[PDB]
């Protein structure tokens, strides 16, 4: 059966599984799934383009500065001139710092039956490919 | 910071990447993403159910609901009684056969930079990691 070792289908389904577990207590926290990708992006980052944060929360441009509209209105994040940079404000990371260690315990929970080795190796393998294949 | 070693981001920047560069050449042979993610799944399986295409398509059900409708009507796919389940017809296959091909190319070129250990390790991580977190 062609899709059963199909990187880019078992890629999305993992994804897919694994992001939506953790939306769910996204939202039981009050956060849309795009709010929670852009604060997560930002938290602990020098400021970064617009271009940047679209790539890292897989959304597209025009629907990121929108969001990022509505979310510089309620003073989560801040758009300045460098091209646009963006960065989290103390509000938005204070906002968004029990949801991110309650996402390093999900995290833990779906690494753990893997072990230490296999996660890392996991993980060095995804962030090798990302950088090879972004633009 | 907190992202760059995040395994939800990582997947799911990784599998954006990975699926846009074969997703433009789908296109290039007049598929959809959706109806390749349809067609793909379907080739060289057993009849599965609606709710299973869906998982493995990573599309919501009343959108592949809608999507079979229309590839049905073109004669792509067939849906039968059981819970329904679909299949992917004869014209569908060969609609789809080169683009399957292609598909097989750009994974190997995909994977070839890390060698066949490190990309059966994570195909199979991916593997195990889908049926842990399936429903």
Same mark, same amino acid.
């Given at each position: 059966?062609?899709?059963?070792?199909?990187?880019?289908? &078992?890629?999305?389904?993992?994804?897919?599984?694994?992001?939506?577990?953790?939306?769910?207590?996204?939202?039981? +926290?009050?956060?849309?799934?795009?709010?929670? *990708?852009?604060?997560a992006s930002l938290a602990g980052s020098e400021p970064i383009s617009i271009?940047?944060?679209?790539?890292? /929360?897989?959304?597209?441009?025009?629907?990121?500065?929108?969001? &990022?509209? *509505?979310?510089?209105?309620?003073?989560?994040?801040?758009?300045?001139?460098?091209?646009?940079?963006? *960065?989290? /404000?103390?509000?938005?990371?204070?906002?968004?710092? +029990?949801?991110?260690?309650?996402? =390093?315990? +999900?995290? *833990?929970?779906?690494?753990?039956?893997?072990?230490?080795?296999?996660?890392?190796?996991?993980?060095?393998?995804? =962030?090798?490919?990302?950088?090879?294949?972004? +633009?």
């Amino acid at each position: 059966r062609f899709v059963d070792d199909y990187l880019p289908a &078992l890629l999305a389904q993992a994804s897919q599984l694994i992001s939506s577990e953790f939306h769910e207590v996204a939202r039981q +926290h009050g956060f849309s799934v795009s709010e929670w *990708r852009v604060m997560a992006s930002l938290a602990g980052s020098e400021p970064i383009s617009i271009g940047q944060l679209a790539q890292v /929360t897989v959304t597209k441009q025009p629907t990121v500065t929108r969001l &990022l509209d *509505r979310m510089e209105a309620r003073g989560q994040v801040e758009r300045l001139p460098h091209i646009t940079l963006v *960065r989290i /404000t103390r509000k938005g990371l204070k906002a968004v710092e +029990h949801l991110m260690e309650l996402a =390093r315990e +999900h995290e *833990r929970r779906v690494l753990e039956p893997f072990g230490l080795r296999r996660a890392e190796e996991l993980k060095q393998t995804l =962030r090798q490919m990302i950088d090879l294949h972004v +633009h």
